[PDB]
Amino acid sequence: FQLGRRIPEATAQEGFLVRPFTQQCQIIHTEGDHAVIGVSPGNSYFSRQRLRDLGLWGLTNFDRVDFVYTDVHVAESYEALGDSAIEARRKAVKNIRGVRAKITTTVNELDPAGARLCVRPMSEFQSNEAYRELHADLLTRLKDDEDMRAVCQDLVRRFLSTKGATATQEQVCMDYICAEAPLFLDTPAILGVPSSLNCYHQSLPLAEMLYARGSGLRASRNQGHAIVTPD
């Protein structure tokens, strides 16, 4: 249930349906500067074949493509689901090795020279100054603004109710989403590209806020989101 006025529909491209979240995201998709293909560890959707298909779709449609796999708050999520701390870390380490390796093989196969397609962990952005400024700003607004925070908690509970939940599961999920958020706000600032489309096979839980009309916390005018699913 999207809140904008001319909701884009999906365009079929190299085996995917690409659905930009707003009309302005569709302009960014058409610019073809940059895509982030976010990848979650422990998620069987990201098979070797699906990653290859994504990487081919990406290089066909953008000048540059960055696969970014989430490697932060993974052990914490497994603990919040009931694993011991030791076993949560064991499984996080295993799932993070598997997704890193599948992506790395993909990228070596498609772009041996590392010219257009790159993979990196989400934690690598912790030393990026724009990422750090985006993250701190987001945390400060949540701390300072309880109405904005309440909207984000509702969006977290909606997202968890699909995948009820405890306070701990909510808090860890908020942490996990806050850590990805700078790439959903301003990948152009973090990666130095003209514009960027942040792509996933489900809409981002905070999309309704970050890509909305009005004012508040909003993604950069050069940042877009698309939902990208197999045709």
Curated annotation (Swiss-Prot):
Belongs to the CDPS family. Substrate binds at residues 43, 176-180, 200. The chain holds residues 49 to 284 of 289 of the full protein. Homodimer. Keywords: Transferase. GO terms for molecular function: aminoacyltransferase activity; ligase activity, forming carbon-oxygen bonds. It catalyses: 2 L-tyrosyl-tRNA(Tyr) = cyclo(L-tyrosyl-L-tyrosyl) + 2 tRNA(Tyr). Disulfide bonds: none annotated. It comes from Mycobacterium tuberculosis (strain ATCC 25618 / H37Rv). This is Cyclo(L-tyrosyl-L-tyrosyl) synthase. Changing residue 200 to F: Small but detectable amount of catalytic activity (200-fold decrease). Involved in the biosynthesis of mycocyclosin. It uses activated amino acids in the form of aminoacyl-tRNAs (aa-tRNAs) as substrates to catalyze the ATP-independent formation of cyclodipeptides which are intermediates in diketopiperazine (DKP) biosynthetic pathways. Catalyzes the formation of cyclo(L-Tyr-L-Tyr) (cYY) from L-tyrosyl-tRNA(Tyr). Can incorporate various nonpolar residues, such as L-phenylalanine, L-leucine, L-tyrosine and L-methionine, and to a much lesser extent L-alanine, into cyclodipeptides. Cyclodipeptides synthesized by Rv2275 always contain L-tyrosine. Its EC number is 2.3.2.21. The record marks 91, 176 as: Could be involved in aa-tRNA binding. Changing residue 40 to A: Complete loss of cYY-forming activity. The reaction proceeds following a ping-pong mechanism forming a covalent intermediate between an active site Ser-40 and the L-phenylalanine residue. It is an enzyme of class 2 (transferase).
